Structure formats: C-alpha cells, structure tokens
C-alpha cells in the first residue's frame, strides 16, 4: 500500500504535468487577446474623440478599473449584495463552489467569510449526505417499477442491477447535466458547450466563476433564479450517491 | 429521518439568510460607493472632454469593463500559461479549489477541462484519502512517544487522548495554517488577515480566486508556485484526515 500510494502520487504528478502541457498548448496563443481588445478600444476612442489625449484616456481606464474593482457595474437590480445575491454568495461558500465573480472588499467580510465557511461547509455536507441518501432511495425505488419490466422479460437480475445503475446515472444526467444546459443555453445566451462547461464546473464544485447563472432577481421568467438555487443542491447530492459507489469500488479493488 | 431532514433544510436556509444579511451589511455600502465613484469619474470626464456624449462614454466603459473582465491590465498597452502556472491551474481543478484568476479562452481548453476534471478530481480524492490515512497514522503514531510521558504522570487516559488530539491539531495548525500565512504575508506582500483568508479559502477548497499565491506578474519564482501546491496537498489531506477522525469519535 506504501508502494501503491507513491505510484499513485507519481501518476497524479504526470497527470498534472500532462495537463500543464495541454492547457499551455491550447490557451497560451490566446493569452494576449483581452489586452489587444482593450488597446483596440482605446485606439478607436482616440480616433473618434480628438479632444482626448492617449494619456488622459489612460487615467480614465485606471479610474474605471478601480471602480469596477470596488464592485461597480457598467450602467446602461445590478446590486450584487442585495439579499438575493448575498444569499447566493453565502451558498457558493457552504457548497465550496466559490465562484468569486463578486469578491469581498471589506476585511470585516473576509474575516466573517472565514467563520461562515468553517461552520457552514460541514453543516451543508451533512444535509448533502442526507438529501443524497433520501433522493437516491426514492430514485432506486422509482427504477424498481422499470426493474419489474426487465424481470418479467426474464433478464438475469444482476444485469438488471447494472441496467438500473445505468438508468440511475442517465435519468439524473438527463435532469441535472442535460436539462440545465438546454435551460442555460436559452436563458444566459451561452453556446451548448459553454453551458455544459458551467454545469460540470459547478457540480464538481471547482466553480472557476468565468461563467455564473448569477442568482440576480429579474423578470421575463422570474421563476428562473429560484430554480437555479434548488438545482445545485439536487445536482451535488446526485453526484454524491454516484461518486461514493465509484469511490468505494476503486479503493477496495 | 424525514423530520430531521426538513429541520436540517430549514436550519441551512436560515444559515444562508443569516449569511446574506451579514455580507450585505458589510459589503453593500462599499459596492454602492464604488458605483458612485464610477459615475463621478464619468461626469468629471464629460465636463473635461466635450467631443464625447454621455452615451458614447457609456459604451467605452462597457467595452473597457469587458476587456478588464477578460484579464486585460489597465497599466500597459500590448505569461499566465507558462509551464509553472499551467501546472498550478491543473492543480486547482483536481483539488476542486478552482481559483479561476486566469480562465480559459478556447472551446478546446474548456471541453478538455471537463474530461480532465471528471478523471482528475476522483483520482486525487483517492490520493487525498491515501495521504490522509498515512499522514494521520504518522502524527498519532509519532505523538504517541511524547504522549507516553503524560500517561505515566497519571492524567486520566480519556483526557490524555484529548490533550494528544489538541497537540495533534495545534502542531498541524502550526505547520499548515500559521506557517503558510506568515510565509504568504512576507512573500505576496499581503496583510496577516489577507493571508489567513487566502489559506482558509484555499484549504476549504472554496478557492474564490480574489487572492492567489504566485499569480503576481512581477515574480520570477519558478519553484514557488508549483511548491505552494506541495503545501495544498499536505493541508487538504490534514484538513480531510482530522475531520474524518473527528467523525469516528462523534458517531
């Protein structure tokens, strides 16, 4: 087991060095895009507004950056610490997703966020394991109806345990990995790829924050942000049931 | 139990509503001031440059915001995927910290990052549980030598288990909380609070990405950023290992 652990360490190290080579190869050529776009914006603004020196448009951007840095939104609601978005932010902590698309400015908020997390995350892990067992119980009994169909067609009952486990991961993959992506695709105006990326980045609790649903109160479909809160709970709980049986079989073998 | 399950859901709901009230109370005044400051900057710039409509200066800020959002630096006019930082980025995925201080531009990178995570995270959870059981054995085994002295001086054996467990968490807290915060405090030029914040946000794997060690454009510290990950491994395994031994002595 000592020998295996380092074999597994060396595997993971080569898995990261391999990842590092790939991401570099794909992403390094498009490092400079954002900066080129900012410069392209400056140069067009100067060409269009001649009473503006390059250096004066320089200080504007730095001052604009500092306001955006302090949490300002380009105005053309937007409040990201209204009770809705603050509730959402609190949720990104206890879920350990931590998008960071809206970051804390105050030392008070950072100090608070520490104790909020240390009490909140484990409190949530108990509810997650609780909803994980409950939703999994309901679902495996629900498949018990389709298991009855396969038993009457005289199929070996251990093949039915695999077919049920396959249906178990596909029925919830339909409800938590496909349904949301098609929802987000239309609601957020993302591409089908951008949507699946967000969904998986979220449910893995990696939560980069490059893409966020947001939980900002709006209309056109006011029943959207309420169902996005609810989805992450159910989706994370759905993973847990799966990743414990995959994790249980990989550590015993 | 369905009764306890719903009581737990109401508890967590009030825990988030309570968090929401607090964060708003602490953060929102700063945010709304920042908004006033943006508007103050616009109004000041219009008054200085009359060849610019309000609405045209509107689009500039939107476009400038979006470029800054994409990671453009206000300071220059013109590597975050050097082998060091790309290795680090890969580390933020399998650890499920996911700082996201440098995010992926290509569809290729995002599609790859999906399969990289679905394979990587559980592969790491096995190493974490492996180092966790190993690291926990070594400390409880190692302290057992120093624990022996206190048992012979006739402190009740249930209370020496607590004293050992206290020393066990304080030696680990020293090595994987206090040591790193004092390190980052000097290395990154953060405040002692900013450092503890980062450390805890990292080890909780919340990984906001507002603060990232080795991110600094200036630093030519090649071993530093990967070597921070050596800490992250040990810290997360300790964070895991101690909370699971806590779980055994509870249940």
């Amino acid at each position: 087991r000592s020998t295996t652990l380092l074999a597994l360490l060396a595997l993971v190290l080569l898995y990261l060095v391999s990842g590092a080579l790939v991401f570099r190869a794909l992403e390094q050529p498009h490092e400079q895009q954002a900066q080129r776009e900012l410069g392209e914006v400056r140069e067009k603004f100067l060409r269009a507004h001649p009473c503006v020196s390059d250096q004066e448009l320089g200080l504007l951007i730095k001052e604009v950056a500092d306001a955006l840095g302090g949490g300002a939104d380009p105005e053309t609601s937007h409040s990201a610490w209204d009770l809705g978005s603050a509730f959402f932010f609190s949720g990104t902590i206890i879920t350990t997703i931590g998008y960071g698309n809206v970051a804390l400015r105050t030392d008070a908020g950072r100090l608070f966020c520490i104790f909020y997390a240390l009490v909140g995350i484990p409190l949530f892990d108990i509810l997650l394991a609780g909803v994980g067992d409950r939703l999994g119980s309901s679902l495996r009994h629900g498949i018990g109806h389709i298991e009855a169909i396969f038993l009457k067609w005289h199929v070996p009952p251990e093949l039915v345990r695999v077919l049920s486990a396959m249906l178990f991961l596909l029925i919830g993959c339909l409800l938590f990995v496909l349904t949301p992506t098609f929802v987000f695709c239309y609601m957020e105006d993302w591409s089908k790829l951008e949507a699946i990326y967000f969904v998986i980045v979220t449910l893995t609790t990696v939560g980069f924050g490059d893409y966020v649903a947001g939980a900002d109160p709006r209309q056109d479909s006011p029943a959207y942000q309420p169902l996005v809160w609810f989805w992450i709970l159910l989706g994370l709980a759905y993973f847990a049931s799966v990743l414990t049986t995959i994790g249980n079989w990989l550590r015993v073998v | 139990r369905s009764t306890t399950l719903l009581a737990l859901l109401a508890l967590v709901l009030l825990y988030l509503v309570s968090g929401a009230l607090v964060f708003r109370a602490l953060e929102q005044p700063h945010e709304q001031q920042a908004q006033r400051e943006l508007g103050e900057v616009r109004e000041k710039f219009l008054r200085a440059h009359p060849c610019v409509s309000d609405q045209e200066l509107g689009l500039l800020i939107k476009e400038v915001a979006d470029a800054l959002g994409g990671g453009a630096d206000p300071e220059t006019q013109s590597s975050a995927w050097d082998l060091g930082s790309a290795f680090f980025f890969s580390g933020t995925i399998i650890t499920t910290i996911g700082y996201g201080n440098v995010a992926l531009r290509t569809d290729a990178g995002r599609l790859f990052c999906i399969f990289y995570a679905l394979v990587g995270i559980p592969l790491f959870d096995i190493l974490l549980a492996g180092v966790g059981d190993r690291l926990g054995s070594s400390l409880r085994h190692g302290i057992g030598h120093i624990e022996a002295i206190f048992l012979k001086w006739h402190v009740p054996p249930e209370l020496v288990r607590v004293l050992s467990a206290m020393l066990f968490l304080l030696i680990g807290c020293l090595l994987f909380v206090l040591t790193p915060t004092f390190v980052f405090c000097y290395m990154e030029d953060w405040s002692k609070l900013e450092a503890i914040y980062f450390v805890i946000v990292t080890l909780t794997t919340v990984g906001f990405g507002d603060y990232v060690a080795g991110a600094d454009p200036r630093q030519d510290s090649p071993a530093y950023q990967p070597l921070v990950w050596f800490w992250i491994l040990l810290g997360l395994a300790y964070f895991a290992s101690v909370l699971t031994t806590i779980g055994n002595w509870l249940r």
Partner: antibody, heavy 116, light 107 residues
Framework: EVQLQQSGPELVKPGASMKTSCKVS????????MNWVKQRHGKNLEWIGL????????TYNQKFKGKATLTVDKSSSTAYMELLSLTSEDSAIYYC?????????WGQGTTLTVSS | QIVLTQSPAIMSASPGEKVTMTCSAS?????MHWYQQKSGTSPKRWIY???KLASGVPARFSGSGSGTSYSLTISSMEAEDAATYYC?????????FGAGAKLELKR
C-alpha cells in the same frame, strides 16, 4: 460669440414629415454635442435626442425614438432634425442646444404647426 | 427618466424680496442646472454645476443643493428677474427638466 441659428417656422399637413436645421458659429461644430429640445405650448421641456456631429452617433428619448431623425452636415456646420408622420401633438417650439451635461447655448427656436 | 419636481409652478415677489425656488429629484443627482426663459425667447443657461453662474447672470442669483434637493435663490428680486426658471439634470441619461417655476412681479 457662439450662436445657433435655426431655420424659420414650418407649417406642415397632418401625416407629412418635417426637417428643420440649425447652423452653429463662434466655435467648432464638430467639437461639441448637439441636442434637440421640444417645448410644447410653453410647458415642460422634453429632450428629443443628441448627435455627436464628429462621430454621427445619435441617441433618442425612447418617447421620440421613431419620430425624430438627427443628422449633421460637417461641411456647412449644420445640424438637422426630421420629424415623421406628424400629428397635432407635434405642434411645438423646437430648439437645437449644445452640451454633454448642461445645455450652454440654445438656438432662437423653431415653431412647428401641424394643421390642415 | 429621473423626475424633477418644481413646486410651486407659480410664485410672485415684490422687488427687493428674497426668492428661493426648489427642484427635488426622484432619485439622487450629482449636479443640477438651471435655465431662465423670458416669454418669446428660448431658454438661457442661468446656473450650471449646481451653484456656478453663466456669464451674463448677475451676482444676486445663487444655486445650491445636493442629492435630491436643489434650490435657485435671488438675494434681492429685480423686475428683470421675472421669468420662468427650469432645473435640468444629466447625472443619468436621458437628461430631464422640471415643469418650470414661473416668477411674476408682485404689485
């Protein structure tokens, strides 16, 4: 001495369109934003829209979006406003005025009369 | 469309009287501007950036305020001060005006 000189008063049939003009002087036409304001039988002043005569950029009051079309002629340093499918409600005084925060110099005004 | 409210819409003063007309904004505003219009003629910028006098404007006129509540004040009413005063705002697009305050002479 800065001066906005509007075209005379126009009288058009209901349903027809109207174009009125405003020639600036004492400054650089292209150097400042031109606005148009409606004052309706001497009551509260309505900002119709602005044009950046240098860029040709136009934003309108959502109320006037379909009615008004602002254009300039850089060469003659003249701003134009065109009102479309006119109703008796459009009979007003219309001012071109200069500014990007305060309307510092105004034209003499032009009086539109929609009437059969 | 920030609402400016000039109440009362009509007011009178004997010459030598202090006049103070006011303009309240539906939401906060960084600076208020004021126009003087005399019947027959277009408006003329009177006070801009809240308390700044446009060139012709005599010293007896004065502006002040902040937030949602601004005021144009004449220390000592004159005959030639009798006109309509409008408050304007361009702290948010679109810019908007008051109803106007019509100031008549008292005799």
């Amino acid at each position: 001495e800065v001066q906005l000189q509007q075209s005379g008063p126009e009288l058009v049939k209901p349903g027809a369109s109207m174009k009125t003009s405003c020639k600036v002087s004492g400054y650089s036409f292209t150097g400042y934003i031109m606005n148009w304001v409606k004052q309706r039988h001497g009551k509260n002043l309505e900002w119709i829209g602005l044009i950046n005569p240098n860029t040709g950029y136009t934003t309108y009051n959502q109320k006037f979006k379909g009615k008004a079309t602002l254009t300039v002629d850089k060469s003659s340093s003249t701003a134009y406003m065109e009102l479309l499918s006119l109703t008796s409600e459009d009979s007003a005084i219309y001012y071109c005025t200069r500014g990007n925060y305060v309307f510092d110099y105004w034209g003499q005004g032009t009086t539109l009369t929609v009437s059969s | 469309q920030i609402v400016l409210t000039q109440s009362p819409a009509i007011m009178s003063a004997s010459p030598g009287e202090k006049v103070t007309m006011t303009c309240s904004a539906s939401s906060s505003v960084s600076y208020m501007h004021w126009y003087q219009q005399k019947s027959g003629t277009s408006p003329k910028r009177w006070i801009y950036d809240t308390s700044k006098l446009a060139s012709g404007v005599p010293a007896r006129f004065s502006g002040s305020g902040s937030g949602t509540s601004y005021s144009l004040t004449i220390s000592s009413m004159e005959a030639e001060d009798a006109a309509t005063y409008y408050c304007q705002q361009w702290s948010n697009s679109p810019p908007t005006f008051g109803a106007g305050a019509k100031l008549e002479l008292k005799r």
